[PDB]
């Protein structure tokens, strides 16, 4: 529905969602946006209530600004928070290699304090990181990608703690103010007070409490019952806040004349210093959140308060003791209890500006924390709002930040969603964040909540799962890093047709209704009783009659990627998420196809590619051609909207962007306009709805073995091309520099008879390996040779030159046609790194025509190598001739799970083949229901279904029974799954019926050349001359130690030894036997651990002398 | 080096002669520095580039 270019992949909606697809993607941006704070977002936020939100900026400004000296006589302030505007299709930078950005102006204002005066100055600030419609930032035509680090909400937090000693429940809580130090109270073993602050032994609190002014009375009074503390007033022995205080204070420093400071100053400072003591408003906010506190209090500050301090303290006491709720004076009550890290309300998440903002923050700070410095020194008088500016270091970082911004991580432009996934991708680790070398599984741990939060399934994978992820599906997330699941907030067998974005918490209080659930068409789930998670998410049954809220659909904590394959309910999650991640590693070959089957996700998902040239106006078409297309913006109005092609990925792939229609036709904004990449008929082309079947065969689909057609070739089905950029600079240095001529020493002809006038050939030109390349050259040196030579040269007049004959030449597995020409000169002004005056970068096609053996696959994780190629003929094949797509061993699924593969595929041939319900007279019962409408399948046509919703077996099965028998109204197929092809070879019948079908799959960014290597020899650590592994190099595989042990298990000695010597780095035998070799002869028998020799020396060295004899 | 600077040095002192202390000072100082040779802050403040 709601789809301009809509077809219909007819699905199986047994259900309904009034709700509809959010926009995801939005995300950050918005932030950014908000961070910015556009009168957009401004409007945005602005709407949906929202008092006085603020572009993540200001703030900045005001969180410091305005300004002033320490002399209290020069007053600066700010203003004009804002920017200018970019200067490119970005696309420009893209090509133009720089990054995309737009200038910043802002208008602070200094003011004397003496006279007090005026120094505004709408100062420029910075051209700036300018996002993308992809909501992104492709530094210098080059973007990484940032995800947010999950972050359990900071704050003073609570628990019981037992002591096997006595087992007593020394509960407690910390304090953790942003940037504010620490200080914590803790159910003492023996009486009483988990006093000490951010690591200071312990005290009698009140010494601090009283220390601020507290008659031991006042407490006991308000705090005698409240007896354990009474002990505190006991052992507290010492008195006089001050007496303490100062004494404390020593407890602080320690050792120092307790000046009144000791009596207060820093103390307050310490944590009454929003000057520096600076928790988090949201926390701040929290806080109240903690405890129905001031609450009625649109507040904001680091305003520490002994007030609440003690408050929650006696909270402690009251609890350790067991006590439900209770209301502090005024402060409405709170049911007592510890806390949790685990749950997610415990647990916010970060976001750009936020970051940024932090970054930046110090940035100014920094750069800021200077004018101060200078402010002063910067004599009064003529010292303009300018005079003292220099954000430079800011962007320096900032800018920089990206450099280092390890979390910005180059968008794997391998497929769309893949890139997506990358988007929504989410963890909580790294810079300042965790260091997996320190985190208990729990980190990875499951837990209830979780639903409607992030794909249960997917995750990292190596030592990595339970560490990272994304969102679930819908539920937006807090203006403060917390999900926003709306719900079927039910009402009296009549759910309240109503979103309710929810932070798990709260909520937690509430009643877990069930999607997939039969209402009396009214909310009135027709049963009296139901189930539902409870306090512990206690997925508990119950009488329908009682919940507050149901849900928002089925399937939600899901991921998109998650959201992708049915039969789940039959299939290994392991295997699953496996396929999940898998999913991505398709490889947009060429053909473009969609599984005739597949849910709705799909392009409606894919649309969220938001990539395809896609309508902008109900305009009629206009001129068209594969670069763009003029667009009759029917307001007269037009715009030859463009279209890209032949431009590499992060992974070597075109810019292709295939059209749709006709320069004359007529259509309307937002509707499609032209695919391109992973973009089958407006849709991730992703595989091949492909026959094949069931046998494990002649041992070739065995142990992962895999048996594969061939026609394929021919068919071509399997290829695209791939892209290196091809670079090689012209440099500058000692003996001269790095020329790029075309002349060359005793170079072959043609070898040159090929390049351009002065080096490399010309675009779209074919090659191979070795193939020389550049037109480079460099001075050689100056250190004589043997007369012998020269002489020799005199002998052959080959009057040698003297220049470091230098250039480039094609390595291995390499060919195609000329492309790149990023020949960019320093000298030609083309800014570039030192000692260089230019550089080109180039590209070449190569259509990868799919080797067998390799690996592909599709849904049901159901990965699959690519064993053998196999000619057509020679092939089991329709009794109607037509043979397989390939075949399939058995076995795994059993010990695996994923049989939908089976079903789905049944299905496959089905759809692929269509049918019609011959319900006629009446009803296929199992029919008697369901998307009726179908009734049939026009042999082969569009077919989707819901996730946790779709027809059934029997049905499905019975669907089997159903049919669109072929030409000869035939169905070699059995209402059964197993027919009986014969042999494209020997040919005869088979033993028994033949299970078979079809399956779209996908193809792999992982094969030989990805990893096709060894190494005969090459470079060698100018230090530990080991195989200098490298590009030019094959690396030359390293070796293991066990291994060695293996030897041992034999003792080939030598062998190993040898190694150690040889290929290890036997300078000699390397040379030496290398010779031998060269001379092929009873090899220079293994010598001596040489070096080892060193040792000795090495020893001696320390008076160490000794010896064997 | 260092050493060299030293034996060369407080050595080269010798020769001259004076309230030794001086020499002691180095001397040990040397020793030390040596030791350093042996290992660094192994004793006391390890030297650090």
């Amino acid at each position: 529905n709601s789809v301009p270019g809509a077809p219909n992949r007819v699905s199986f909606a047994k259900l309904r969602e009034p709700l509809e697809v959010p926009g995801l993607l939005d995300v950050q941006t918005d932030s950014f946006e908000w961070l910015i704070g556009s009168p957009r977002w401004r409007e945005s936020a602005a709407e949906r209530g929202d008092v006085n939100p603020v572009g993540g900026l200001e703030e900045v400004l005001y969180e410091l600004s305005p300004i002033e000296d320490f002399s209290g006589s020069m007053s600066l302030s700010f203003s004009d928070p804002r920017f200018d505007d970019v200067k490119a299709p970005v696309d420009e930078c893209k090509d133009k290699d720089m990054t995309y950005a737009a200038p910043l102006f802002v208008t602070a204002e200094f003011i004397n304090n003496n006279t007090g005066e005026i120094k505004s100055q709408t100062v420029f600030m910075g051209d700036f990181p300018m996002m993308t419609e992809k909501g992104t930032f492709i530094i210098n035509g080059t973007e990484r990608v940032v995800v947010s680090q999950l972050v359990r909400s900071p704050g003073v937090y609570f628990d019981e703690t037992i002591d096997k000693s006595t087992d007593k429940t020394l509960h407690s809580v910390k304090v953790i103010p942003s940037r504010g130090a620490w200080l914590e109270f803790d159910v003492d073993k023996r009486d009483t007070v988990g006093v000490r602050i951010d690591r200071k032994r312990r005290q009698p609190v009140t010494v601090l409490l009283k220390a601020l002014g507290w008659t031991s009375e006042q407490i006991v009074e308000r705090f005698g019952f409240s007896e354990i503390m009474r002990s505190t007033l006991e052992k507290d022995n010492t008195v006089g806040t001050d007496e303490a205080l100062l004494d404390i204070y020593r407890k602080l420093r320690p050792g120092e004349p307790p000046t009144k400071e000791s009596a207060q100053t820093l103390l307050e400072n310490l944590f009454f210093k929003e000057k520096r003591y600076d928790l988090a408003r949201v926390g701040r906010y929290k806080v109240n959140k903690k405890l129905g506190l001031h609450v009625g209090e649109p507040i904001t500050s680091s305003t520490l308060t002994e007030e609440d301090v003690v408050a929650t303290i006696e909270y402690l006491v009251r609890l350790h003791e067991g006590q439900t709720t209770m209301t502090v004076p005024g402060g409405v009550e709170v049911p007592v209890e510890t806390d949790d890290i685990d749950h997610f309300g415990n647990r916010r998440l970060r976001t750009v500006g936020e970051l940024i903002q932090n970054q930046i923050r110090v940035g100014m700070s920094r750069m800021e924390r200077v004018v101060r410095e200078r402010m002063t020194t910067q004599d009064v008088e003529a010292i303009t709002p300018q005079t003292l500016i220099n954000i430079r270091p800011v962007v320096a970082a900032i800018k920089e930040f990206f450099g280092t911004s390890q979390l910005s991580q180059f968008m794997d432009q391998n497929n769309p969603l893949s890139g997506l996934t990358h988007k929504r991708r989410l963890s909580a680790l790294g810079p300042g964040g965790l260091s997996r070398e320190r985190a208990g599984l729990e980190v990875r741990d499951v837990h209830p909540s979780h639903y409607g939060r992030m794909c249960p399934i997917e995750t990292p994978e190596g030592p990595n799962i339970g560490l990272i992820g994304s969102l679930s599906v819908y539920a937006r997330v807090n203006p403060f890093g917390f999900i926003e699941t709306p719900y079927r907030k039910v009402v009296d067998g009549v759910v309240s047709d109503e979103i309710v974005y929810l932070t798990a918490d709260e909520e937690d209080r509430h009643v877990v209704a069930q999607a997939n659930s039969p209402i009396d068409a009214d909310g009135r789930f027709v049963e009296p009783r139901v189930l539902v998670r409870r306090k512990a998410g206690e997925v508990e049954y119950v009488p329908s009659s009682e919940v507050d809220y149901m849900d928002v659909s089925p399937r939600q904590m899901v991921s998109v990627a998650t959201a992708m394959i049915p039969f789940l309910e039959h299939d290994d999650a392991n295997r699953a998420l496996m396929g999940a991640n898998m999913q991505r590693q398709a490889v947009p070959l060429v053909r473009s196809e969609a599984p005739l089957v597949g849910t709705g996700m799909e392009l409606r998902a894919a649309i969220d590619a938001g990539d395809v040239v896609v309508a902008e106006e109900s305009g009629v078409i206009e001129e068209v051609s594969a670069d763009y297309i003029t667009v009759m913006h029917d307001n007269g109005t037009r715009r030859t909207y463009r279209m890209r092609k032949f431009a590499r990925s992060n992974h070597g792939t075109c810019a292709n962007q295939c059209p749709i229609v006709d320069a004359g036709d007529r259509v309307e904004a937002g509707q499609v306009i032209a695919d391109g990449p992973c973009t089958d008929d407006g849709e991730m082309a992703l595989g091949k709805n492909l026959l094949v079947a069931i046998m494990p065969w002649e041992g070739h689909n065995y142990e992962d073995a895999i048996i594969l057609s061939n026609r394929l070739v021919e068919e071509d089905v399997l290829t695209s091309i791939h892209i290196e950029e091809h670079e090689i600079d012209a440099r500058d240095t000692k003996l001269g520099a790095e020329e790029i001529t075309r002349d060359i020493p005793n170079i072959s002809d043609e070898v040159l008879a090929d390049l351009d006038e002065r080096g490399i050939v010309r675009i779209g030109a074919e090659v191979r390996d070795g193939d020389i390349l550049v037109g480079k050259v460099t001075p050689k040196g100056e250190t004589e040779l043997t007369p012998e030579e020269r002489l020799l040269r005199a002998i052959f007049g080959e009057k040698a030159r003297e220049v470091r004959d230098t250039s480039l030449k094609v390595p291995h597995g390499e060919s195609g046609k000329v492309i790149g020409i990023r020949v960019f000169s320093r000298e030609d002004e083309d800014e570039l790194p030192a000692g260089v005056n230019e550089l080109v970068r180039v590209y070449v096609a190569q259509k990868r025509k799919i080797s067998d053996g390799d690996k592909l696959a599709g849904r049901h994780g159901n990965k699959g190598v690519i064993g053998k190629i196999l000619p057509v003929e020679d092939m089991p094949f329709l009794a109607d001739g037509t043979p397989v797509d390939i075949i399939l061993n058995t076995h795994g699924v059993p010990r695996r799970m994923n049989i939908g593969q089976i079903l789905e595929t049944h299905l496959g041939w089905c759809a692929h083949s269509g049918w019609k319900v011959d319900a006629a007279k009446g009803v296929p019962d199992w029919a008697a229901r369901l998307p009726d409408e179908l009734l049939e399948a026009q042999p082969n046509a569009i077919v989707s279904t819901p996730v946790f919703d779709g027809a059934q077996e029997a049905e499905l099965q019975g669907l089997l029974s159903c049919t669109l028998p072929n030409r000869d109204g035939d169905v070699l197929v059995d209402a059964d799954g197993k027919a009986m092809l014969f042999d494209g070879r020997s040919g005869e019948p088979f033993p028994y019926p033949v299970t078979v079908g079809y399956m779209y799959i996908m193809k792999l960014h992982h094969l030989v050349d990805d990893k096709i290597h060894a190494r005969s020899t090459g470079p060698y650590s100018m230090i530990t001359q080991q195989p200098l592994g490298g590009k030019a190099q094959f690396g030359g595989q390293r070796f293991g130690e066990m291994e060695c042990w293996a030897m041992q298990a034999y003792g080939a000695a030598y062998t190993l030894q040898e190694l150690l010597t040889i290929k290890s780095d036997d300078t000699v035998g390397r040379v030496k036997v290398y010779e031998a070799i060269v001379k092929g002869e009873n090899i220079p028998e293994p010598g001596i651990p040489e070096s080892f020799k060193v040792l000795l020396k090495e020893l001696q060295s320390l008076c160490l002398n000794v010896e064997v004899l | 080096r260092r050493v060299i600077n030293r034996n060369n040095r407080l050595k080269r002192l010798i020769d001259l002669g004076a309230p030794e202390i001086i020499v002691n000072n180095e001397k040990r100082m040397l020793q030390e520095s040596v030791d350093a040779l042996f290992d660094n802050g192994r004793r006391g403040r390890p030297v650090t580039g």
Binding site: T192, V193, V195, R196, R201, R202, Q203, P204, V205, V207, T232, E234, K235, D236, N237 | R43, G44, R45
Partner: peptide, 24 residues
Amino acid sequence: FVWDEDESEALRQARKDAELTASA
């Protein structure tokens, strides 16, 4: 008595040894 406990021990060495550092 609102003292946690092992200020000594630790503080007593790091004091002690600390001195020891004063040997350098």
